[PDB]
């Protein structure tokens, strides 16, 4: 319901994934990040539901080599740090 404004980096990635506006609802951010991840194929079975983003700008976005898609509080947290408002 609330609209959030992404930082330039998170923005360039969302657009690159299909987004066509510069403010979103959290659900939209997650939706597009999902597509980005599927696109650049950073998610794998095996693993343990892990996104490997060590050579990707997403890794710089979130500041990690990888993460579990299974703990939403962390993800929302890594995302909130890239929300300008
Ligand atoms: C197959 O997918 C899973 C499998 C398992 C499992 N243990 O079997 C757990 C979890 C998932 N997936 C997910 O939660 C949800 N699937 C992820 C997408 C993905 C392509 C990685 C499968 C997820 C999503 O939908 N957008 C998004 C953006 C991220 Cl950065 S991450 C993520 C997860 C997610 C959904 C809703 C809210 C949040 Cl905060 C969230 F992080």
Swiss-Prot record:
This is E3 ubiquitin-protein ligase Mdm2. Belongs to the MDM2/MDM4 family. It comes from Xenopus laevis. It is found in: Nucleus, Nucleoplasm; Cytoplasm; Nucleus, Nucleolus; Nucleus. It comes from the Eukaryota. Residues 2-85 form the SWIB/MDM2 domain. E3 ubiquitin-protein ligase that mediates ubiquitination of p53/TP53, leading to its degradation by the proteasome.
């Amino acid at each position: 319901e609330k609209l959030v404004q992404p930082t330039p980096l998170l923005l360039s990635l969302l657009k690159s994934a299909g987004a066509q506006k510069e403010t979103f609802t959290m659900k939209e951010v997650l939706y597009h990040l999902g597509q980005y991840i599927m696109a650049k194929q950073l998610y794998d079975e095996k693993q343990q539901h892990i996104v490997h983003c060590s050579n990707d700008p997403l890794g710089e976005l979130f500041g990690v080599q990888e993460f579990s898609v299974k703990e939403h509080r962390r993800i929302y947290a890594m995302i909130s740090r890239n929300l300008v408002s």
